DNA sequence: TAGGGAGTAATCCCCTTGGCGGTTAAAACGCGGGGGACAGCGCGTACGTGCGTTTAAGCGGTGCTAGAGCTGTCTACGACCAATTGAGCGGCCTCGGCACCGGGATTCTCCA
DNA sequence: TGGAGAATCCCGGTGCCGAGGCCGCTCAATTGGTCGTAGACAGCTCTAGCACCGCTTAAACGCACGTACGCGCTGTCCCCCGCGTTTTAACCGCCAAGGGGATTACTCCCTAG
């Protein structure tokens, strides 16, 4: 299953941070839902790198190359 | 005997969470979902140790950034409790939707 | 003044014999063509970048193919572009 | 000089692999241009145009129509999942919208 | 036709024209007024104008759907200066 | 003050494209402002580009890059 | 002759010399223009200065000599023009602002 | 094994501003990372300005309008400042 | 027709895969329990509808020249090329800023 | 106005790991010439943008009226919230193993000219 690996308390903790007073019982599984969308896009991305470069070990950079081509730059590594 | 009223301590929590830099998803259940993702694209991959943390960091950076637009919807239909309708309408505009 | 007019023609004469195109649809699909252009050949160039090569082969234009179009589409686009090239190769 | 055979020919294309191989060489995508990226490129862009231009005269035949438009090249680019998430971003002159009125404002 | 209903055929009647909404004069008199401000005496090609409205009718039209979710979601039917702002602060133009 | 030729009729239509019933009549203004921000930036990129083909009239390709800069391209020009 | 690097004979700290070879080897051109590094290297220094002044003054409210991550962030979050440049990015170990909506409050 | 960076650059800018103040390896790879990505947006813009108007250099002209384009505000007016003066030292020399 | 980028084999090392054992923070649970969501209801006002008058949108002409685009020259700046050297890369150095921990001093809640 | 006691902050000592730094050295950055064409410039044409003027009449705009929708107010009690609590497995620290990313060397056919 693993995605039940990203607990309600983690999902509370970050629903915090973004300033969230009162969290209704679904928002958790539809949090799940929506954070294994956008790592399937990165990911199908970051293996597409990947595997363009003869690779098999998925490197920092194909990540950073994957969230730049989505928008989402990342600035710490690369 | 002593209770904080409902609402208190979420306040003393928003107050700590927006303080710290800290990563609020433990670090081994996110290695393990972002493996049992990888092995649909390609069996037997290898990651390296800051591909998983930069992953994370983007992940946590998309949802708390999500958070807000949805709080901000909830908030116009004059609520403070956030729901799918919240989220959904947050991913729409934005655009993801 | 070039355009990919021309063949945006046999192409519509082709999938839609007797049926024409109006001088503003040409316009808007001609800026279709020349858009997929730029983007396919970019990411191509900064793939090619970034594995430190210098050339853009038929591999680079499949996995930039591959990124930028969607699901079906990519896939659909993929075998067409393998199609072409092997044709190309056996001639 | 043997006879020149186009290389859109030698492909089986009606797109120009001469001029693609010009925009990608003179186009400063990188130092050097193989044959089979031109071949490749000019495939990729004649299927998506084939797409759109089918879609776009079924659209225009539904509307009992002769003649491709930019409303009926607008219709046809959202009514497909796969288009429409490729030129999401893109607006079309001349284009107009898909009829939409939600269901709280419909009569009750 | 009973109230409401002369709504929704003006939707309608919008919805399937392809016409620009905004009067041409008056928009291309904008467009001066405001080019005036980032260099003077500055000539516009015809066509340029035209480009300039398509996008702007699209933008606006993009930012009423969006709007209109925003009011939709607050349980009304009536848009407001705060779905507006709600829109253009999730899309990130703030 | 060019602004309020922009009509309240003009931008009813607008709102009746996008599928809008009813609209409270502060709309009109912050319709107005909206507007103009987004043709500032518009031709802003339009003249800058402009200048530096060391043009005086400002052409359709201009407004055309703007728009794509702007992550809103506009095809048909 | 005695070497004058381009940086100092144009005032600057950082590289003229890699600057150049980078906007030819880059393949953004056929040509690249003796003054086109130059301006380049002014400029990314100028905006390098800029965010280390306001990470630094950041730093220093924090009673700390090091910039850390969460330094950045706030120089770049508390700055309308920074903000505005860099509105799409994540930067790790950064975290929020610190804001609580108004109707939250008890 | 061989990895150039900004980090040198970086340290001496900062002990200009701040002579007291020091930097994280984690800031230095953001800052290198800040470097690179601006490095990749002013010559991207001055590579397509060139292309656009039919020259095949990017000069000082193409980099300012790149610079108008890419930065906001004032940090346009001040970017377009040092490069000029940069310019002028360096010619005039 | 030229010549060098890349495909390939010999080689290896560093960082990723992987396991193991102990600790404890954290995650999840057995049971209570509530305040703000929501439904209902009433009321007033602002938006829709229509009706009449005013106002410039829009057509279409006329005219004029600004300025975009082309064309021919020529120079100065960049590519290249070879020699030279010093600034920057690896990695080893060493000492101080921060993490941490505990402990004490304080602000604050919320309800009597 | 007033307590219990919890969450919070500030001080101070410790020590560790990484912030700020130094030695070789090499390869890239500079120097100094050569050259040839890209682009700057000057001149010229004529396209289209600007400016203006008169007329028609579609639409805008101003007004009046009423109604239904927004909005305020009330009352009920859901399913999510919450505690101390119990359970669980990450985390941490350490260690073996060796995959495949990285280097060098060569050779040849790919694409440039």
Redo the contacts between chains.
């Keep these: 299953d693993?995605?039940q690996?990203?607990?309600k308390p983690?999902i509370r903790?970050?629903?915090?941070?973004?300033?969230?007073?009162?969290?209704?019982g679904?928002?958790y599984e539809?949090?799940r839902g929506?954070?294994?969308v956008?790592?399937?896009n990165?990911?199908?991305?970051?293996?597409?790198?990947?595997?363009?470069?003869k690779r098999?070990?998925?490197?920092?950079?194909?990540?950073?190359?994957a969230?730049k081509?989505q928008?989402?730059?990342?600035?710490?590594?690369? | 005997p002593h209770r904080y009223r409902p609402g208190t301590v979420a306040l003393r929590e928003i107050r700590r969470y927006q303080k710290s830099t800290e990563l609020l998803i433990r670090k081994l259940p996110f290695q393990r979902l972002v493996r049992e993702i990888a092995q649909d694209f390609k069996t037997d991959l290898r990651f390296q140790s800051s591909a998983v943390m930069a992953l994370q960091e983007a992940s946590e950076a998309y949802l708390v950034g999500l958070f807000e637009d949805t709080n901000l919807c909830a908030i116009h239909a004059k609520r403070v409790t956030i729901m799918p309708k919240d989220i959904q309408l947050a991913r729409r505009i934005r655009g993801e939707r | 003044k070039e355009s990919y007019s021309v063949y945006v023609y046999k192409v519509l004469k082709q999938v839609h014999p007797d049926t024409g195109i109006s001088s503003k649809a040409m316009g808007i699909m001609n800026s279709f063509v020349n858009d997929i252009f730029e983007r396919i050949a970019g990411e191509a160039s900064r793939l090619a970048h970034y594995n430190k090569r210098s050339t853009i082969t038929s591999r680079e234009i499949q996995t930039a193919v591959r990124l930028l179009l969607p699901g079906e589409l990519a896939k659909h686009a993929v075998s067409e572009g393998t199609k072409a090239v092997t044709k190309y190769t056996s001639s | 000089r043997a006879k020149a055979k186009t290389r859109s020919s030698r492909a089986g294309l009606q797109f120009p692999v001469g001029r693609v191989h010009r925009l990608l060489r003179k186009g400063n995508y990188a130092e050097r241009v193989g044959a089979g990226a031109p071949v490749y490129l000019a495939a990729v862009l004649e299927y998506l145009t084939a797409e759109i231009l089918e879609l776009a005269g079924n659209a225009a035949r539904d509307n009992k129509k002769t003649r491709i438009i930019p409303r009926h090249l607008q219709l046809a680019i959202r009514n497909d999942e796969e288009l429409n998430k490729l030129l999401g971003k893109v607006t079309i002159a001349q284009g107009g919208v898909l009829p939409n009125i939600q269901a709280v404002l419909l009569p009750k």
């Design positions: 693993n995605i690996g990203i607990t983690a903790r970050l629903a915090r941070r973004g300033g969230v007073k009162r969290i209704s679904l928002i539809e949090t929506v954070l294994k956008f790592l399937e990165v990911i199908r991305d970051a293996v597409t790198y990947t595997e363009h470069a098999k070990t998925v490197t920092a950079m194909d990540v950073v190359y969230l081509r928008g989402r730059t990342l600035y710490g590594f690369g």
